[PDB]
Design a protein around this nucleic acid. Structure first.
Ligand SMILES: [K+]
Ligand SMILES: [Mg+2]
Ligand SMILES: [Mg+2]
Ligand SMILES: [Mg+2]
Ligand SMILES: [Mg+2]
Ligand SMILES: [Mg+2]
Ligand SMILES: [Mg+2]
Ligand SMILES: [Mg+2]
Ligand SMILES: [Mg+2]
Ligand SMILES: [Mg+2]
Ligand SMILES: [Mg+2]
Lengths: 213, 98, 86, 25, 61, 130
RNA sequence: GUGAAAUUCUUGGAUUUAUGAAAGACGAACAACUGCGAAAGCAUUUGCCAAGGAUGUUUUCAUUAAUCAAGAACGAAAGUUGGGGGCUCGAAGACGAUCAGAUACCGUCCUAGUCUCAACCAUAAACGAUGCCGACCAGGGAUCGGCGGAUGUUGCAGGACUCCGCCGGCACCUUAUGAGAAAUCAAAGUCUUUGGGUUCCGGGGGGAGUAUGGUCGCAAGGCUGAAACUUAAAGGAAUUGAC
């Protein structure tokens, strides 16, 4: 807010559609407060609706991480994908079965991350039962299917494809239709992703997923 | 004199049920006995939605909802008019209003 | 269906006892039977219990016939079923 | 008078009597 | 100083019933509808002055 | 530039005692203007009143024009945690004045901290008796 | 923080915002007139270990059974002995506030405790205020587990759904022709037209679950448990007023 500070602009990764993401501040050069080190904010919450210019995906949230500050830009990278409280609170309904699964899969880039999936039983078109529950011996099989599908689509090439299958519902739809032999399982997708560990900066692989700025 | 057949709670076929805390006084009440409600409301009300519509950057932004399950002890529920005292014959009426 | 005043306990309807519990019938009777399962090929004479509990085999290829379940043994789709009686 | 507090008073009397009796054995 | 015309009267409210809660719209901007309270006698079709146009109200105060 | 909106984040924190309007950078590690409802009133009871939040929102609107903050992301929250979770009385007016004081609003979310299962709430087992 | 304030924190930066690590406790929403267990009680995932009800059975033994003095297992919370842990909350204590007074209700800081391991205690409105086993006697729909049949849809024999039936369970609704002092109860019915089996247990209200003895416990205490004296009522259900 002072007469000092510099107006930097963030750069979303090339994987999305729009790279311009707001503006940010930093102390210019005062003493030991280096601008390069001070701009390692490393967390930016966006909606993924702006990054795709489509409004129906506003329920999502993308956590970007500032990796390297260069050329008055910040050059962020993926650091997480979560949900807004609105969608999660809207989904959980009474007279229903909630199934939650989670795994700790690992990618080739040594990006240890944790994935969470959430699912709900679906009533049939001709249903007079007012509850639509499931037996625990069935929800356990659903959870096993969720975990095995998660570790099947993961454990593959770099995270680029992993987020390429996150902004669409590829894991969620695959789990949905791989469990129809047990229950219909409506509204299935990845609740949130937590990055447990990053390998290193690696000094250059970030520029392979960024444009010319 | 037994005022209610179920004793004022909803316990059958079990001996113990964990409690909750009333949202107004923080008094421990059994989960089945507590008066539970689910309130769903707009973040901004009708007087506010008009002024927030044009203030929104894009017209495609649907206004967000908020959902809250609240629990009340009998004293707080009665004092807050969540549930009134009913007549002896109307006490058995478990039908929700409308 | 006023009450048993119209029906006769001695001579009750012959179909209503097809649905009561076996113990609760006028005379207790089993609900099971024996069937001579015929495979797709030869060796079609093997006799098995309806509510079987052991996974029976066939001399030819062991031709697994039935799986024991909570009730009637799960005959395979390939094995043909006909019943023998007294 | 609440019977709970009457029971508490009785317990206090009992322990005081026990102490008095232990004094003289 | 945003003159408003009383649009409907929502019955006398308050401890003594002295305040009367009404709905008004601005003469500068007809389409904006607010709720306020007024002392004294008020009938529909009247024009009422004010000082602060941002204060809101509640139904059946 | 003009038209295209520079976005800040308003961390409205409306309890039953105060009302914080805190505008930060997208990261949240910066701070543009942080004013509570208690700054604009001379009695520590009226801090949570809607009019104090109205005044504080007017001041944040005045401050956030000189730096080019042309739109806000609102993250409304309440006490949260193990305590009360509904937003305070001043939550709406503080928002409403933002709309009225020529300020653009982006996404509106609720970020009240909810526990999956909290520690013991204060007051005792019998609760706060009046 | 409060109806309102103060005790307390704070320009050495309190409150607030973002990131990260650690610690202990706790398992929201899903969660129900739903499930399991002898009761107390039991709610994140996964693996292991033994156990259990119900269902199915043209498997087996053949009265092996029901209830039980004595005698035993288990038994919320608080409490006791040590070791660890010690986030939050919080008996005792202190302070602020209200008040004629406030050793209380309202605020804040907190000790034992709240968590866990190895031992003790043996009590609760431990309640369905309703011991266990067996037979019969109205109807109805819903629901949980298993099984039998029919049925025609699923981005998929079987699973999900629909319909009928049987056994077992938690309950619910209507009505006595039943019972009851009544509230009410489908069992609290089949009772002067009194008898299916068996265990425990009450004899007007106090004194009193007190005294003492016995006995278990480190203790707090538990089990067993009177008498003198006093009293004409105490009490249950419903009714009309008054508040
Ligand atoms: K209730
Ligand atoms: Mg099923
Ligand atoms: Mg009463
Ligand atoms: Mg049971
Ligand atoms: Mg109990
Ligand atoms: Mg949970
Ligand atoms: Mg269940
Ligand atoms: Mg004994
Ligand atoms: Mg007892
Ligand atoms: Mg069934
Ligand atoms: Mg007597």
């Amino acid at each position: 807010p002072f007469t000092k500070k510099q107006w930097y602009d963030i750069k979303a990764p090339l994987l999305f559609t729009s790279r311009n993401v707001g503006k940010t501040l930093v102390s210019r050069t005062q003493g030991t407060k280096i601008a390069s080190e001070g701009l390692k904010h490393r967390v930016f919450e966006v909606s993924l609706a702006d990054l795709q210019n489509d409004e129906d995906q506003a329920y999502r949230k993308i956590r970007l991480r500032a990796e390297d500050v260069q050329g008055m830009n910040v050059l962020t990278n993926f650091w997480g994908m979560d949900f807004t409280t609105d969608k999660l609170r809207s989904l959980v309904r009474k007279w229903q079965t909630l199934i939650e699964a989670h795994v700790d899969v690992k990618t080739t880039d040594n990006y240890m991350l944790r994935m969470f999936a959430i699912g709900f039983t679906k009533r049939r078109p001709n249903q007079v039962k007012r509850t639509c529950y499931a037996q625990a011996s069935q929800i356990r099989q659903i959870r096993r299917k969720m975990v095995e599908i998660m570790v099947n689509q993961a454990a593959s090439c770099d995270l680029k494809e992993l987020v390429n299958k996150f902004i669409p519902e590829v894991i969620g739809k695959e789990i949905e239709k791989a469990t129809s032999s047990i229950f219909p399982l409506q509204n299935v997708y990845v609740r949130k992703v937590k990055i447990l560990k990053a390998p290193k900066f690696d000094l250059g692989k970030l520029m392979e997923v960024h444009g010319d700025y | 004199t037994f005022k209610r057949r179920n004793g004022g709670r909803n316990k059958h076929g079990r001996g113990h049920v964990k409690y909750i805390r009333c949202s107004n006084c923080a008094k421990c009440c059994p989960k089945d006995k507590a008066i539970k409600r689910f309130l769903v409301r707009n973040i901004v009300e009708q007087a506010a939605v008009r002024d927030v519509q044009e203030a929104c950057v894009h017209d495609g932004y649907v206004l967000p909802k908020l959902y809250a399950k609240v629990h009340h002890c009998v004293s707080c529920a009665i004092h807050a008019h969540i549930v009134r005292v009913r007549s002896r014959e109307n006490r058995r009426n478990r039908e929700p209003p409308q | 269906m006023v009450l048993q005043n119209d029906i006769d306990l001695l001579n009750p309807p012959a179909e209503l006892e097809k649905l009561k519990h076996k113990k609760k019938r006028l005379v207790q009777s089993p609900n099971s039977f024996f069937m001579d399962v015929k495979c797709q090929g030869c060796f079609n004479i093997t006799t098995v219990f309806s509510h079987s509990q052991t996974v029976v085999v066939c001399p030819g290829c062991q031709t697994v016939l039935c799986q024991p379940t909570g009730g009637k043994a799960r005959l395979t789709e390939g094995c043909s079923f006909r019943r023998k009686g007294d | 008078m609440r019977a709970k507090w009457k029971k508490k008073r009785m317990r206090r009397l009992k322990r005081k009597r026990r102490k008095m009796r232990q004094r003289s054995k | 100083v945003k003159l408003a015309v009383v649009v409907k009267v929502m019955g006398r409210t308050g401890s003594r019933g002295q305040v009367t809660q009404v709905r008004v719209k601005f003469l500068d901007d007809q389409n904006r509808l607010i709720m306020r309270n007024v002392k004294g006698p008020v009938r529909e079709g009247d024009i009422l002055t004010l000082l602060e146009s941002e204060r809101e109200a509640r139904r059946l105060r | 530039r003009e038209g295209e909106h520079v976005f800040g984040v308003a961390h409205i924190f409306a309890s039953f005692n105060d009302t914080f309007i805190h505008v930060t950078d997208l990261s949240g590690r910066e701070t543009l203007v942080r004013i509570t409802g208690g700054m604009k009133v001379k009695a520590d009871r009226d801090e949570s009143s809607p009019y104090a939040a109205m005044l504080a929102s007017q001041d944040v609107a005045t401050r956030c024009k000189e730096l080019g903050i042309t739109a806000l992301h609102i993250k409304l929250r309440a006490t949260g945690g193990n305590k009360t979770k509904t937003p305070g009385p001043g939550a709406q007016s503080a928002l409403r004045a933002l709309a009225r004081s020529g300020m653009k609003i982006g996404r509106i979310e609720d970020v009240t901290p909810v526990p999956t299962d909290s520690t013991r709430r204060k007051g005792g087992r019998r609760g706060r008796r009046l």
